[PDB]
Design a protein around this ligand. Structure first.
Ligand SMILES: *[C@@H]1O[C@H](CO)[C@@H](O[C@@H]2O[C@H](CO)[C@@H](O)[C@H](O)[C@H]2NC(C)=O)[C@H](O)[C@H]1NC(C)=O
Ligand SMILES: *[C@@H]1O[C@H](CO)[C@@H](O)[C@H](O)[C@H]1NC(C)=O
Ligand code: NA
Lengths: 194, 217, 221
């Protein structure tokens, strides 16, 4: 009867942002005060709900979205943001109701000589809809001529890797992000915080 | 980014079929079906002939075919004709936004032996005024290309003051032509009387000579 | 129909720069790419780089990285290529070609621009007649020609009767004389019955010196 937030926050590896993970949270009780109490989090913003006094509300569903981005891009995990992350990788709706939790993970997700395992989408024909996930790897036609599955010239492979080196400035260091969405559907509410 | 290896020259009889090889590495010819072929006639821009290895742009004859096997592309010309005499270049994508050409292949059409028609030209009076005499010997329409031209002035073999030029194979008759120019000073030119071109060619029963006497219309 | 018209052949001193123009027409300029391909005399073709008139993207091979710059005027429909620090193995003919990009082909080519890298002066040709012989030299056929001599910057265009006479014409490759000047001959075989009735004029153009010479070739006295 206890919500499995440890599985998400204290997770060995995180997903690349373009292939962000989503964990369905239900049938459990959660202390968002115990979460807030962790001093690890460099970012803890909430939208439409007060962080404190969250253990009194009950939501039908709770989603825990998690991924890794550049430190400079944490600003983009917010309603109404623009940039490569919000436009092409992870998009929040304007009426987002939930919290955005982020923390520096240079100690875990940086490797000497570069960690290129973490990717992000750099090109897309259009912007993502809110909470849309695009793992396609079609070649992006930036020019007027077709590509036919080859990268050259105005044709680009759409994914690019972060160069996560431990020497990077804080703006180019890896950050782990957890986004909590609170769905209040007209169904049995199964996540509370007594 | 290293050149593609084509045979320097390919020859074939008329109506035959010949093939031009184009070899690269795995990183270019092997990786992409992006081989194109170009045909360059003498003194002209190349012509787009093949693309994607085997396709023909609308306008190219159907006897130009494309083939590919491993790291080697191949152009095949069938029903060979005189108009097919040209230089052929292959081109391949090499990755990294880089195109890379081949060394080029000269296509020669084999034909029957043709003896040359020999003509000899004395220098124009206009040129003598300026102090130099150019004597020109024309060897016209001959197959094969091998020929010997000799200058003999008052029956003495001249050496070291003549230059030759050869046309590429002609696009209608499959023959070559050759000019030989003998340059003398105006003073040397008038020291002598008989200027003679002597031509040796496989098509001639025995060498042909054409001559003139200086100062005789 | 598709067309690419390039700038005229020119001489450049070693170390100078040259900008070759390439005017496109008959198609949407930005719907394709522009590649430049050069050809040293008697040598193979060399890809020099690409430019997209769409977004201005360029790519050059490592060999020419730094020394070449490709630009595109989307209003004039004209592609320019510029090559600095000109050396003597940069003497070549320079083609612009419409580029299918990853379509995989150079569709249509321009006529080319012969860039000669040389410190020598631009000198014009002297044209001399190769006169038809008094004897009917061969069967019913006679030969006549023009000798184009002493012109430093190649190329030279020769036509016969302003294009009316193309059959049996042979213009030889220029030869470099010891003087450092070029020389060539253009010849044509015509029927012997026509020497008195028909006039024969060779039209020699040396655009590097803007000299135009027409020479009547007729039998001597
Ligand atoms: C995630 O891992 C952290 C790091 O160990 C855990 O933090 C501990 O939490 C307990 C319970 O509050 C404290 O008594 C310890 O002092 C904490 N350890 C450190 C090193 O600070 C945390 O419990 C784990 N779970 C979650 C949900 O964060
Ligand atoms: C492009 O060039 C880089 C740099 O040397 C090389 O590592 C890579 O293999 C090349 N890519 C292709 C597709 O040839
Ligand atoms: Na060749």
């Amino acid at each position: 009867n206890l919500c499995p937030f440890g599985e998400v926050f204290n997770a060995t590896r995180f997903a690349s942002v373009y292939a962000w993970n989503r964990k369905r949270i239900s049938n459990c009780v959660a202390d968002y005060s115990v979460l807030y109490n962790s001093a690890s989090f460099s970012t803890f913003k909430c939208y439409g709900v007060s962080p404190t006094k969250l253990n009194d509300l009950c939501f039908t569903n709770v989603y825990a979205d998690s991924f890794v981005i550049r430190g400079d891009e944490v600003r983009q995990i917010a309603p109404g943001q623009t940039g490569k992350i919000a436009d092409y990788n992870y998009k929040l709706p304007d009426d987002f109701t939930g919290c955005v939790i982020a923390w520096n993970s240079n100690n875990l997700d940086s490797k000497v000589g570069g960690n290129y395992n973490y990717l992000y989408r750099l090109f897309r024909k259009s912007n993502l809809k809110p909470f849309e996930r695009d793992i396609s790897t079609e070649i992006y036609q930036a020019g007027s001529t077709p590509c036919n599955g080859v990268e050259g010239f105005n044709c680009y492979f759409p994914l690019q890797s972060y160069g996560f080196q431990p020497t990077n400035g804080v703006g180019y260091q890896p950050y782990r992000v957890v986004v909590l969405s609170f769905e209040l559907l007209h169904a049995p509410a199964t996540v509370c915080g007594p | 980014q290293s050149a593609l290896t084509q045979p320097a020259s390919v020859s074939g009889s008329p109506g035959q079929s010949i093939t031009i090889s184009c070899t690269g590495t795995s990183s270019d010819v092997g990786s992409y079906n992006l081989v194109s072929w170009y045909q360059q006639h003498p003194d002209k821009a190349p012509k787009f002939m093949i693309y994607e290895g085997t396709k023909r742009p609308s306008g190219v004859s159907n006897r130009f075919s494309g083939s590919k096997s491993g790291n080697t592309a191949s152009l095949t010309i069938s029903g060979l004709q005189a108009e097919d005499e040209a230089d052929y270049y292959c081109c391949s994508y090499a990755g990294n936004s880089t195109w890379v050409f081949g060394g080029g292949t000269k296509l020669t059409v084999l034909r029957t032996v043709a003896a040359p028609s020999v003509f000899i030209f004395p220098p124009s009076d206009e040129q003598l005024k300026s102090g130099t005499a150019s004597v020109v010997c024309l060897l016209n329409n001959f197959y094969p290309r091998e020929a010997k031209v000799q200058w003999k002035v008052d029956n003495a073999l001249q050496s070291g003051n003549s230059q030759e030029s050869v046309t590429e194979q002609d696009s209608k008759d499959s023959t070559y032509s050759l000019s030989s120019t003998l340059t003398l000073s105006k003073a040397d030119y008038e020291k002598h009387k008989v200027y003679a071109c002597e031509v040796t060619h496989q098509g001639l029963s025995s060498p042909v000579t054409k001559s003139f006497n200086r100062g005789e219309c | 129909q598709v067309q690419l018209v390039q700038s005229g052949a020119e001489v450049k001193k070693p170390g100078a720069s040259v900008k070759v123009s390439c005017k496109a027409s008959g198609y949407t300029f930005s719907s394709y790419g522009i590649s430049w391909v050069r050809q040293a005399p008697g040598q193979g073709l060399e890809w020099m780089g690409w430019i997209s008139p769409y977004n201005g993207n360029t790519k050059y091979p490592q060999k020419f990285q730094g020394r070449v710059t490709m630009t595109t005027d989307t209003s004039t429909n004209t592609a320019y290529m510029e090559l600095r620090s000109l050396r003597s193995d940069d003497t070549a003919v320079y083609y612009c070609a419409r580029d299918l990009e990853l379509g995989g082909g150079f569709d249509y080519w321009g006529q080319g621009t012969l860039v000669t890298v040389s410190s020598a002066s631009t000198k014009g040709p002297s044209v001399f007649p190769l006169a038809p012989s008094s004897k009917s030299t061969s069967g019913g056929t006679a030969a006549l020609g023009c000798l184009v001599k002493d012109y430093f910057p190649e190329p030279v265009t020769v036509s016969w009767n302003s294009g009316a006479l193309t059959s049996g014409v042979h213009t030889f490759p220029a030869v470099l004389q010891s003087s450092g000047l070029y020389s060539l001959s253009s010849v044509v075989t015509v029927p012997s019955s026509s020497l008195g009735t028909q006039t024969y004029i060779c039209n020699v153009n040396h655009k590097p010196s803007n000299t135009k010479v027409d020479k009547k070739v007729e039998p001597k006295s």
